[PDB]
């Protein structure tokens, strides 16, 4: 689970390689950010000469979480790194495709463009 | 903290009287034709002779 000051790997080709959570949107004094949650972030590392720079304030949906996530069927799911995709203000990604697998909880949070670009959707 | 004032006689005799001994109860034992009194928790060892009646 992701709160403020967590650093996340970035799972798309926007040039950003590592962001840093600031808020967890979705209410007042919200503490944790599961799969399918918008995050205000700050880009702490970036490839030289890209679309984004170091020091930008962007938004991002979380697609991978190390902490286990209960699903309604009784199953669980657990990734091995924390990953986010930078989004536009219409729930569309800034880049053009997604590296690594993404979770199925993006499907009820109406993020349909990120699932269709993903290699594998679990 | 320290005591502010000395207690009266009626206040220090009320607490001190509640420091007392709870007496146990005694039952009857016949050993070797002799009668004694032990508590019931020691009734088996009296019949096994493991109680020195002094």
């Amino acid at each position: 689970v992701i709160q403020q000051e967590s650093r996340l790997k970035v799972a798309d080709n926007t040039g950003a390689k590592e962001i840093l959570c600031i808020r967890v949107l979705g209410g007042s004094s919200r503490r944790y950010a599961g799969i399918g949650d918008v995050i205000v972030a700050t880009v702490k590392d970036a490839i030289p000469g890209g679309n984004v720079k170091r020091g930008d304030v962007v938004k991002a949906v979380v697609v991978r979480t190390v902490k286990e996530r209960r699903r309604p069927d009784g199953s669980y799911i657990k990734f091995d790194e924390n990953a986010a995709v930078i989004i536009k203000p219409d729930n569309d990604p800034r880049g053009t495709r997604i590296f690594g697998p993404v979770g199925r909880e993006l499907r009820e949070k109406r993020f349909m463009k990120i699932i269709s670009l993903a290699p594998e959707v679990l | 903290a320290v005591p502010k004032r000395r207690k009266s006689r009626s206040n220090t005799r009320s607490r001190r009287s509640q420091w007392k001994a709870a007496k146990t109860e005694l039952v009857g034992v016949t050993v070797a034709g002799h009668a004694h009194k032990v508590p019931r928790r020691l009734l088996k060892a009296a019949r096994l002779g493991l109680i020195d009646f002094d």
């Binding site: 009784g74 799911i77 657990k78 690594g100 | -």
Partner: protein
């Protein structure tokens, strides 16, 4: 026996194969994408059993695109269509948590 084995007895599923930690297993999961009812295959390595009858779970583990992913299903779950055993394994532990910190070709469980 337990006190609650007369409740779990109708909810048990027969015809589930006998696997162990260290095996490699295909798991066929029913997935509802809208109103479609397709069937998705999860091929991975069984690392865990936490028993108990109706409450027993297992944990499989694969490596999708350079990212390790685990799924923890219940046994006797009707969202699993059928489990099919692929390859046995030769391990000494029973929980296999050392696979979490080994990447790539160093996670090769022996064959027999």
């Amino acid at each position: 026996m337990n006190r609650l084995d007369f409740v779990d007895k109708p909810s048990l599923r027969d015809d589930i194969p006998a696997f162990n930690p260290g095996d490699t297993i295909n798991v066929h999961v029913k997935v509802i994408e809208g109103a479609k009812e397709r069937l998705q295959v999860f091929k991975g390595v069984v690392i865990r059993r936490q028993g108990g009858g109706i409450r027993e779970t297992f944990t499989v583990r694969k490596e999708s695109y350079g990212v390790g992913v685990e799924r923890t299903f219940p046994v006797h779950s009707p969202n699993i269509d059928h489990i099919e055993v692929v390859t046995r394994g030769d391990v000494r532990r029973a929980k296999l948590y050392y696979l979490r910190e080994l990447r790539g070709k160093k996670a090769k469980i022996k064959e027999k």
